């Protein structure tokens, strides 16, 4: 269906952008709003309300650019805003080598049902935060399965 | 001022801040503002954004060696419609011979539309505008803003 074709197109755009950033070790933080509304966090960022493309996602996160610092938040199959604030987790059970990008992803996942993807600037490793837990060192197939399950 | 007029002012401020930033850093840029002649044919050649304008997004689009930087950004009113768009190349003899494809594309679209196109040179950082087949070079920040204000 149209709705299903649109969701798969968005998943493919996300996975292509994540793969590009993982290969180049570009740090990234991408939160997908689900049933819990995230308007309060969207409003801290730069409004985009933009169509999803792998190209725009990549351009947003290039280091030392206006939009790279903070989270992209997606809502209703669009990029709602970039450079958004997310709350930092105080969980003592996050790997100690990880920094604020991963703590921000876990933090938003503690108070929403959202799914957040993180690319590490140190290793290019891909992880996902959901329900207060961080799932680390994901393959491409694993990330796709998580997006399709979500 | 009406909401329409305030929105125009915000968009002009976003454009000028982005152009000034890229000019200082010699970030090449090609930004076409649709006016009364519709540019759908050219918008459809690019990557669709349909995004709210901000100086930050305009800058991020044109960073060298990124997916979106090669080609034109086309704006419709207060939105960035698409990036990496094709524009036709002018054959006008009044384009300085040292200028490259961004400037020839800008003059080219200006010959078949009433649009206003801004170009930042990656060689010199100079800012130019193409309108009605003419290229106006080496614009001050003040001159660019006045041209934009007059276009609206
Ligand atoms: O740490 C960096 C990672 C990536 C870039 C970059 C720049 C342009 C295009 C793609 N990547 C710069 C620094
Ligand atoms: Mg002069």
Q: Which domains does chain A have, with CATH numbers?
A: 2-149 (3.40.1700.10)
Q: Which two tokens stand for residue A65?
A: 């650019």
Chain centre to alpha carbon of residue B103: 10
Using N-to-C axis directions, what is the helix angle for B3-25 and B141-151, rounded to 10°? 150
Which of B21, B46, B58, B63 to mutate to probe the A interface, most A CBs <10 Å? B63
Q: Give dist(CA B48, CA B58) in Å, integer.
A: 14
Q: Which two tokens stand for residue A29?
A: 């933080």
Test site for ligand 1: of B28, B60, B64, B65, most ligand atoms within 8 A of the Cβ: B65
Cβ–ligand 1 contact at A26 (below 6 Å)? yes
Beta bridge partners of B83: B47
CB A18 within 8 A of CB A138: no
Q: Verify whether the Cβ–Cβ distance B68 to A48 is below 8 Å.
A: no
Q: Which two tokens stand for residue A132?
A: 């207060």
Resolution of the coordinates, Å: 1.2
Atom of ligand 1 nearest to the CA of B63: 8
Kindly report the CA angle at A54 between A14 and A120, in degrees rounded to 5? 60
Q: Give dist(CA B13, CA A62) in Å, integer.
A: 24
Q: A82: nearest CA in chain B? A: B57
Sheet strands side by side (includes A126-130): A46-51, A78-84, A71-75, A28-32, A115-119, A126-130, A133-135
* Residue carrying the six token digits 């399709």: A148
Helix locations, B26-137, DSSP H: 40-43, 55-62, 101-110
Cβ burial, residue A110 (10 Å; 0-12/13-18/19+): middle
Instruction: Count Cβ–Cβ pairs < 8 Å, chain A vs chain B.
Output: 66
* Residue carrying the six token digits 């006016």: B35
CB B98 within 8 A of CB B126: no
Exposure string for A111-146, b = 16+ CB within 10 A, e = fewer: ebebbbbbbbbeebbbbbbbeeebebebeeeebbeb
**B127-131 and B134-136 strand pairing:** antiparallel
Residue B59 makes CB contacts below 8 A (sequence gap 6+) with A65, A66, B18, B21, B22, B27
Q: A65: nearest CA in chain B? A: B60
Nearest C-alpha to atom 13 of ligand 1 is from which residue?
A63
Residue A104 makes CB contacts below 8 A (sequence gap 6+) with A29, A71, A86, A87, A88, A89
Give the one of B55, B56, B68 whose C-beta lies nearest to A56's C-beta: B68
Q: Give dist(CA B39, CA B16) in Å, integer.
A: 22
The length of chain A is: 150
Which of A55, A64, A65, A83 to mutate to probe the B interface, most B CBs <10 Å? A55
């Amino acid at each position: 269906t149209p709705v299903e074709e649109a969701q798969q197109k968005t998943i493919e755009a996300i996975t292509k952008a994540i793969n590009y950033m993982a290969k180049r070790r570009i740090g990234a933080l991408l939160t997908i709003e689900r049933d819990t509304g995230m308007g309060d966090y969207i409003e801290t960022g730069i409004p985009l309300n933009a169509k999803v493309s792998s190209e725009l996602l990549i351009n947003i996160f290039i280091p030392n650019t206006p939009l790279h610092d903070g989270a992209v938040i997606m809502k209703n199959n669009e990029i709602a805003a970039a450079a958004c604030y997310l709350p930092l987790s105080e969980s003592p059970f996050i790997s100690k080598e990880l920094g604020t990008r991963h703590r921000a992803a876990v933090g938003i996942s503690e108070v929403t049902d959202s799914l957040t993807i993180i690319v590490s600037e140190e290793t290019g490793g891909v992880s996902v935060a959901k329900n207060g837990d961080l799932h680390r060192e994901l393959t491409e197939e694993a990330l796709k399965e998580m997006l399709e399950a979500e």
